[PDB]
């Protein structure tokens, strides 16, 4: 990997994004890639759980637009086809894990950053983190099952706030809002977050599986298929005029 | 031309103004009901990339004119209560078909139907002194406006029964903790406020605008619909009864 | 009976849990067919809605696991299967109830004394009462289909906090996460209780009935399949060597 770090610890598996192909954190075609290697070896793994963290002062801006849109830009449905595929894929195996995944926000998440965050089971986060989904200006329609899951969550009008709105959220406001599941100080941010990693490791596999697979039970066909309807609708926009112009825009 | 209501055809946008002159407190009767619909119908079908919904006066909406209804409904219970009851169907439905973002600008009491047609909206603006009520116990009917799934999927059951059952007010700052405001402003800035925020809104793409409204709808537009005609169909049932009407002169 | 009091009122019927063979209100076989007998009773009554209350400095702690783990000790096969359907049919009862349930709740609510509360209709909380679901300590699944409930009502990441995580909720949170519905000053709590419900056994009848039905056609097949699902979990988890491994901690 050079995107990302994976370190396999005491019945869990920390994986971690820090990109050096892009900023940010950003996520282009090969660190999607990675994570989703990762995340599928973690899936093979003895590990109860997986940590999944950031470097950086940013946790995740999402999508890296400046890598697409010049892929986008030899023509046409096709590079249009393939990102959406990347992204529906990178999504599903989100849907698709079996072991818990907690999420240590310790910076803003954006767009794609922030919509897969609903699809983890723990989100733990900075009280300096941000969350923000600038899907309107970014000229998109939704991403990450967001469609659905922020509107779960929150209800349809909060949710709006965010998918048409397009406002930014403090750690606090995104965990009354059920986005962050737990809100932290930044000064004992990180260890804090490995005692209570560290507790969740030492519980039982069975338990934690069986514990996840009856609350993933009854939503995980409704996350595949709003997938499934996010990404047609982005095959639709990116490979219009009007959506190229947009991701265009910086 | 409208009666009851104000069209501003604007920027990008239109403009629905409650404000009625044939009822008190912008009380829904027949006739303001069907000029919503009307101008909902003409918003739908014109170039508006989203809808200001909003009202004048002191209070946004008081719901239905019972006053209005009872007189009817007193006259010919078995026929006065069929059309009541679709007259209310047809008005939910509108909001349930509409495929324009809807922004609702609260500036003062929603009670009864004028807050379970909120939930319907996309984006539910608020001043600070607006307060929220379903007083449907104290009227003595049972929920209208989808408001038997929306409130329960917006704020969870229990929740969602202190204002259905137990007949509890919101201010407009706890109403936005349960989901059925988005956003609260303060009273000095509000209509300025809003109007800065839906120009900006207007700014946006209409077909992203419009897709992303019909992602979210997808797979709760049925169960609408569904909430819609059985909470009708004992509405029905209950302003056809003797009790019915009976609770409904109190009011 | 022995474990319950049941008080029949203008309109209603109060079910008072004061437990004298378990401590703190605790649940044993013998408790759950008292509250099953007293809920059937009451379902019959000429009562509009039942308050379901407790005495005593907690509201229930939840399962007597001394008490069931002993039983469990020597039959390891068949004591499963009794204890699982015990409290099958113990949370079926609340999902079938058709009359609004309102439980007052004045002091902690902990296990499937948590997890049932989102089947009643309100739940009027002491602002000094907490909630907490501890079943990773426990070593258990969810229980009272709170696999489902909990992630409806606040979403899944908060709901993991309570699932996975073991986190305590006191009553305000536990109001802003939807799980109590109203929270009450414990100086007069008891007596604006009593004002309360008299004033919601004063409406028609016919109304209270309908907003009942109006919310729960929606809901309740998916609560008896949750139920279902969560009992076949536990059926293995205490049927297992670890799993009565985990029931022997107090
Ligand atoms: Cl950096
Ligand atoms: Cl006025
Ligand atoms: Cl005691």
């Not at 069975?206 to 939503?219: D, G, M, S, W």
């Not at 047609?232 to 926009?237: A, D, S, Y």
Request: glycine content about 6%; aromatic content about 8%; charged content about 20%.
């Amino acid at each position: 990997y050079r995107d990302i770090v994976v370190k396999k610890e005491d019945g869990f598996t920390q994986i971690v994004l820090s990109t050096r192909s892009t900023e940010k954190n950003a996520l282009n075609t090969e660190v999607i890639k990675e994570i989703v290697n990762a995340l599928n070896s973690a899936a093979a793994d003895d590990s109860k759980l997986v940590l999944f963290s950031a470097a950086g002062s940013v946790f995740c801006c999402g999508l890296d637009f400046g890598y697409f849109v010049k892929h986008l830009r030899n023509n046409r449905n096709t590079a249009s086809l393939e990102m959406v595929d990347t992204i529906k894929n990178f999504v599903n195996t989100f849907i698709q894990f079996k072991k818990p995944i907690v999420v240590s926000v310790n910076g803003p998440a954006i767009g794609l950053g922030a919509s897969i965050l609903p699809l983890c089971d723990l989100v733990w986060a900075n009280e300096k983190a941000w969350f923000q989904t600038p899907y309107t200006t970014f000229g998109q329609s939704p991403d990450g099952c967001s469609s659905i899951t922020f509107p779960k969550m929150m209800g349809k009008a909060s949710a709006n706030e965010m998918l048409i709105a397009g406002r930014k959220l403090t750690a606090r406001e995104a965990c009354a809002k059920g986005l962050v599941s737990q809100v932290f100080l930044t000064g004992t941010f990180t260890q804090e977050v490995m005692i209570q990693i560290k507790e969740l490791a030492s519980y039982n596999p069975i338990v934690l599986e069986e514990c996840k697979a009856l609350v993933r039970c009854n939503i995980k066909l409704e996350l595949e298929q709003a997938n499934e309807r996010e990404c047609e609708v982005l095959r639709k926009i990116w490979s219009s005029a009007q959506g190229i112009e947009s991701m265009l825009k910086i």
